[PDB]
Every structure is written in structure tokens, then in C-alpha cells.
């Protein structure tokens, strides 16, 4: 147990932090702080993934990846506009979370040999401070992966390649078996009467 500012942090025998705060503003700052204590290099690299700046650290192997991330991503100002559309309190809590990450960054650069993890030392760079927009970047880098695909383009290519070899009527039938409109026998999580 330790009181970081006015939040009590109990680390259990697996190292999991349990945070006891008097209000949400303090809670969410502590949440960002403990996550940075535990995972700062990972947080830094996930942010660089979304910003398209991985190649600054890992070189030309990541240039095309950085280009994709920038092509499909958002500017800081666009993200700030998103944050400004949230409920006041919610935006403020995301800001507190970023302030907690930044609090650990500030502590770590004062004692880098003890508090900056080995990857920063070995790759020869330092963590930067965080803003609320960077927290949104951490959400986008991972969640968007599960939503984003170009299968429509693959489907168009399948049909075109089948048509030019087999003709249109056969290609259409084959495609309908490959990518169906609706398989009425596919197992479902609910029944229509449950809706």
C-alpha cells in the first residue's frame, strides 16, 4: 500500500494495482499513472503506431506501416474536436488520465537510469509527455483493427478473375458460394423472437 497524491494504491501479490480515491478526477489520474509505471514503453510505441512514427525508432522496415496509419488517421486538431464533443466531465477525466501518464514520464526523466525501462536506453530515445488526444490515439490503434477491412476490393478482384476465365454466369454462381448474401443455417447468438 502507498498513497500517491491522495489516492491509495494497493498492489496485490500479482502486482495488480487497486486504486482507492475520493473522486473520479483523482481516480483517473492514478489510473494513467499506474499504467505508465507498468507499461510506459508499450504505451509510447502504441502511440507511435497510431501517429505513424515507428520508423523513427525501428527504421525503414516500418515506413509503409507508418504511411498506412497516417493515411487513414486523424490530425491532433481533429482528435481535439472529437474530445470537445464529449460531455464536459468525460473529457476532463480523459485529461486526468493523460496527466497521470505524464506524471510518470516527468518522474522517470528525472531518474532515467532507474525509471526508464531498458528499451528506451537500448534504442536511445526518451518518452514524451501526453495529452488527451494521445489517449484517443491509444484507443484507435487497437480498436480500429477489428473494424477496418478491404474485403470489398478482394471480392471485386475474385469476381473479375473468375469472370475472365470462366465467363460471367459461372463466375456469379461461384462467387455466391464463396461470399454469400445470408447463410440462413449459420449458428446465431440469439433468435429473432428474442429481439
Amino acid at each position: 500500500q502507498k498513497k500517491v497524491e491522495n489516492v491509495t494504491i494497493i498492489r496485490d501479490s500479482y502486482g495488480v494495482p487497486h486504486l482507492y480515491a475520493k473522486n473520479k478526477k483523482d481516480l483517473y489520474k492514478a489510473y494513467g499513472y499506474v499504467m505508465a509505471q507498468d507499461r510506459l514503453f508499450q504505451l509510447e510505441m502504441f502511440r507511435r503506431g497510431n501517429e505513424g512514427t515507428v520508423s523513427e525508432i525501428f527504421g525503414e522496415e516500418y515506413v509503409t506501416k507508418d504511411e498506412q496509419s497516417r493515411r487513414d488517421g486523424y490530425s491532433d486538431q481533429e482528435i481535439q474536436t472529437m474530445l470537445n464533443g464529449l460531455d464536459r466531465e468525460t473529457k476532463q477525466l480523459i485529461e486526468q488520465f493523460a496527466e497521470g501518464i505524464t506524471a510518470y514520464v516527468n518522474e522517470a526523466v528525472k531518474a532515467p537510469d532507474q525509471k526508464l525501462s531498458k528499451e528506451f536506453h537500448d534504442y536511445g530515445f526518451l518518452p514524451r509527455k501526453w495529452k488527451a488526444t494521445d489517449v484517443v490515439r491509444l484507443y484507435m490503434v487497437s480498436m480500429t483493427y477489428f473494424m477496418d477491412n478491404h474485403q470489398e476490393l478482394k471480392n471485386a478482384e475474385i469476381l473479375a478473375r473468375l469472370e475472365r476465365t470462366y465467363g460471367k454466369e459461372k463466375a456469379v454462381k461461384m462467387f455466391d458460394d464463396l461470399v454469400w448474401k445470408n447463410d440462413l443455417e449459420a449458428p446465431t447468438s440469439i433468435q429473432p423472437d428474442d429481439q
Binding site: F41, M143, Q151, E152, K173
Partner: protein, 524 residues
């Protein structure tokens, strides 16, 4: 990712149950971050993806929650008609429009080099691909474009929710495609396929790109009331392994994940084989799913049926039938000897690979760079099943006679290779286990740490698991969040004691207690 929620009537204790199993790969530091959050009127324990200011897998004082990827149709590609005289102009609503152009600078570590690229947008979204030969550019529209922060807010509201009404309100605000699952201390369960789903033109085939000229635009987003959802479904539970929400829900170009042969069958089989269930039962179902050879459900009966027709003349076929019938359909290593326990599983794997090749190589071989990922998909092989079982298909791939010849030739070839390399007894065929490590690079495709070299058996399993019972007093249960809580490595190489101290739990199907009451937290 998999999930289950069990209502009061299907649970042995009469308390609602929840099981989480998000599949986000295996890395060190881990993709998840576990935490306990406690402020006035808000008490919550569980994990979320790294960097998220909210819990996704866990429970607050009132409710437990989890999620699986929805696979719903939230991305459309628009085929822009380009001006033959100016490739930065596209035709939209009667007029040539200019693309928005953006120059971006990338600093690259060698000294450092600076390289510039230009990116374009249309009214539909970023330009992702060119077909210059066709005077086309392809742009990408996300239904959630610009609403990612509203999705964060919705998840935070789900954390703060106390009942179905408040959780459903949060669900209605989430804009990206997920399944959400809920269980509460009053015994309720609920399921929501969340996301903002566009109202599309009825003039287009939604498996292919949409013309971008303006006649086929989205017309807003459907009401959340039209998203698939259920509170306390009559069956008394919900299971999911990224499968279809409900019978008439469609997902356009990505229907390949929602076919008659679907991996969620492992969870359905397990729940339907039992009466009332407890968390131990849910763990047994997770174990089965994690080690199942998924093609067995529909394809092992087909194989046996064919071999049985010819077992009088072929003694090898009679032996295979006996071994296949006694096999429990798993690739498991219960005695921890480094070999899968059932030798016939090695035969079955090679039989399947041969059968899939023979079914499609002569027709789809030329497009297999695009179609193999469909016809041999990790969630199921529906088309192959329909062809081999003689069920209706649009194209006549193979007659029943031709399908049976494939099954037999694939058997003969697989058995001949095993006889040549291993011997005639199935115990000699047992394959060495496949292992996995928690490495340095996640699904975001960039390195985030140094990984771990500790090998464990590969499992088709969540990257964490929670098992939660919503008792009257509080959420109770158990969980595991490998590899460990803390990713820090000291400058000198010293590893945190919590870098990989949950790997043994994970590998050995053991768990740590779910902590909620502060008196328990203090002694944990």
C-alpha cells in the same frame, strides 16, 4: 474472441454467470491491463486493452461485462470516377470535385532520413487504392469516422452503469462494431450487437465497392433499436465466438465468417450437453474449444460415413473408423509429454488438408491467393461442407460420387505418408505439440517490448479469461491475465517479478481469485 452469459435459470446457483475470452494474441508486455478502480459509487475490477481508460472484461458492483468483435459492416469502399484530364478530381453530385491533398513527412532511422508522401481524401474518406488503368480511385468510409471518442465515452459510461437501462444507454452510444455482454446481481443477462450501422442504397450489392458518384450514398444510420439485441433470451444463455448475431443480420463483404460451419458450435455443443451449469462447467467448455480440431464437428462424420462403405474390402479403413470414433476431437496433451494424445488427429489434419486441396484446386487454384483464406477459414469451411455433404450450392462444384472419390483419395494419401514415415499403429502418428511464446509484436504490427521466450502449448483461447458469478453480495470468481502485470525491464536487464508470473497459471488451466471486497484485496 469468445464469451458466454448464463441466466439465473441455467445456472446451478441461481446467480447469473459471465465468461470472457478476448482473442488479441499473446505478447509481453501483454495486450491487456488489469486494474481495480474504487471511488464513491464506482467499484470495478477487471482488464481493458492497454492504454484504455476503462475496463472491458470484469465487473462493477452491479454488473459484469465482456465483448467480442462484431464483424458487422461498418466499412464501405467507394469507387470514385476520376476525371481523365485531372486524376485529383472525381465526379460527385453532378460536378467535378477536388480531392483534399495532404503532404506528410516521415523521419526514418537509418543518420535519419526524411521522406515525403502525399495522401488524398474525397467526400467519402481517405483514398486507399488507385486503379489508374480504369480511371478509378477507391476511398474508404467508416461509419464511426470522427466518433471514436464517443465510443470511448460510451465504454466509460458502461463502467459507471448500475442496471440494464444505463448499460443499454451506453451500448446505444457506442459507434464501432462489437458484441457486448452483460450479467447482473438481479439475475438478468443481456446481449447487444453495438455499432452505428449505415442505411445503404438498395440499388447496390453490398459485397462489392459502391459507386462514388452520389446516387448511392448512405442515408444516415439506423436506430439502435434495430441493432440485434436481447434481454433475458428464452434459451437462458448466450454464447458467441464471433458468429452471427441473429438469422437476418447481414454483414456484406465479410459474410465468410458467418456460415453453417462455424466454430461457435464448440460452445453450443458444450452448453447444450449440460443441464444447469457453474463456472467449472464453463471452464471445461473453454478447454474443449481451446483444443478442438474444429473441422471434426461436421467433417469427421462425413469421413467416417464414407470409410464405412468400403471397410469390408479395406482393413485400413476399418482401423481408421475405430480410431476416429474413439477420438474426442481434441488436439490436447494431457500427460504433458510434448505430443498430442490422439495419433488419429495427425491423420485427420492431413486428410483435411488433402481434401480441401482436391475440392478447389482445379477451379479456384488460379484465384487461391484470394480464396484459400475463405474456403479454409479459421472459423469454418461451410462451402467445403456443403459440397462434401451434397447440400444445395449455387455452382455445382462436385457430384456426390466425385466428392466421395476425393474423401477416399485424401484418406489413401494421408495414410500412405503416415505408413511410410511413422508406421501402421496410430500411437506412432502422434504429432509433436505446437508451441507459442508471448512475443514482442502484437496485432498492431509494430514492436512494443522485448517479448518472452517461454514456450507454452498453442491454445485457441482468449488472451485473458474471467469467470464471474454475480452473487447477491458481490461479483465472485477467478481469472488469468498472462503474461503478467508489469512490463518494466530495468536498464541493467533485471526483469520485474511480475513480468511473466501468470504464464504458468495460463498454461496449466489455473486461475487467481477475482478480488472485489477491499478486505480481500488487502490480503491478496
Amino acid at each position: 474472441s469468445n464469451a458466454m452469459i448464463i441466466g439465473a435459470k441455467k445456472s446451478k446457483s441461481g446467480n447469473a454467470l459471465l465468461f470472457s475470452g478476448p482473442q488479441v494474441g499473446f505478447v509481453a508486455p501483454g495486450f491487456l491491463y488489469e486494474v481495480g478502480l474504487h471511488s464513491p459509487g464506482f467499484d470495478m475490477e477487471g482488464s481493458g486493452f492497454i492504454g484504455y481508460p476503462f475496463i472491458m472484461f470484469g465487473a462493477n458492483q452491479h454488473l459484469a461485462l465482456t465483448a467480442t468483435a462484431g464483424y458487422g459492416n461498418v466499412t464501405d469502399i467507394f469507387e470514385e470516377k476520376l476525371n481523365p484530364a485531372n486524376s485529383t478530381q472525381y465526379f460527385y453530385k453532378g460536378k467535378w470535385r477536388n480531392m483534399e491533398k495532404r503532404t506528410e513527412t516521415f523521419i526514418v532511422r537509418g543518420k535519419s532520413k526524411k521522406i515525403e508522401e502525399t495522401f488524398f481524401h474525397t467526400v467519402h474518406g481517405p483514398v486507399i487504392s488507385l486503379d489508374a488503368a480504369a480511371n478509378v480511385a477507391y476511398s474508404k468510409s467508416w461509419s464511426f469516422r470522427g466518433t471514436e471518442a464517443k465510443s470511448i465515452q460510451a465504454y466509460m459510461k458502461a463502467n459507471w452503469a448500475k442496471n440494464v437501462k444505463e448499460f443499454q444507454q451506453a451500448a446505444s452510444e457506442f459507434t464501432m462494431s462489437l458484441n457486448w455482454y452483460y450479467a447482473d446481481k438481479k439475475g438478468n443477462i443481456a446481449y447487444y450487437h453495438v455499432g452505428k450501422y449505415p442505411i445503404r442504397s438498395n440499388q447496390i450489392d453490398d459485397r462489392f465497392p459502391t459507386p462514388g458518384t452520389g446516387e448511392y450514398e448512405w442515408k444516415g444510420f439506423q436506430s439502435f433499436a434495430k441493432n440485434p439485441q436481447a434481454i433475458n433470451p428464452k434459451k437462458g444463455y448466450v454464447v458467441n465466438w464471433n458468429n452471427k448475431p441473429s438469422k437476418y443480420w447481414r454483414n456484406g463483404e465479410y459474410s465468410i465468417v458467418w456460415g453453417k460451419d462455424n466454430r461457435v458450435q464448440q460452445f453450443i455443443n458444450g452448453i447444450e450437453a449440460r443441464g444447469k451449469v457453474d463456472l467449472k462447467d464453463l471452464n471445461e467448455i473453454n478447454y474443449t474449444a481451446s483444443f478442438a480440431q474444429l473441422r471434426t464437428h461436421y467433417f469427421k462424420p462425413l469421413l467416417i460415413k464414407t470409410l464405412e462403405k468400403y471397410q469390408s474390402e479395406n482393413k485400413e479403413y476399418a482401423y481408421l473408423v475405430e480410431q476416429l470414433r474413439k477420438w474426442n476431437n481434441l488436439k490436447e496433451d494431457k500427460n504433458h509429454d510434448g505430443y498430442y494424445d490422439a495419433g488419429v488427429a495427425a491423420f485427420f489434419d492431413e486428410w483435411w488438408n488433402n481434401t480441401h486441396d482436391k475440392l478447389f484446386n482445379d477451379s479456384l487454384g488460379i484465384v487461391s491467393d484470394l480464396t484459400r483464406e475463405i474456403t479454409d477459414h479459421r472459423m469454418g469451411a461451410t462451402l467445403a461442407y456443403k459440397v462434401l455433404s451434397g447440400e444445395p450450392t449455387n455452382y455445382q462444384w462436385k457430384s456426390a460420387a466425385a466428392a466421395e472419390l476425393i474423401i477416399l483419395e485424401s484418406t489413401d494419401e494421408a495414410l500412405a505418408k503416415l505408413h511410410k514415415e511413422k508406421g501402421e499403429e496410430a500411437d506412432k502418428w502422434r504429432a509433436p505439440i505446437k508451441t507459442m511464446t508471448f512475443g514482442a509484436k502484437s496485432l498492431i504490427a509494430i514492436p512494443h517490448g522485448y517479448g518472452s521466450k517461454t514456450e507454452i502449448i498453442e491454445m485457441n483461447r482468449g488472451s485473458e479469461n474471467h469467470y464471474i458469478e454475480m452473487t447477491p453480495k458481490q461479483p465472485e470468481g477467478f481469472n488469468v491475465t498472462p503474461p503478467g502485470q508489469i512490463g518494466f525491464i530495468h536498464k541493467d536487464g533485471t526483469l520485474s517479478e511480475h513480468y511473466e508470473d501468470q504464464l504458468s497459471l495460463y498454461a496449466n488451466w489455473k486461475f487467481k481469485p477475482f478480488l472485489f471486497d477491499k478486505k480481500d484485496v488487502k490480503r491478496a
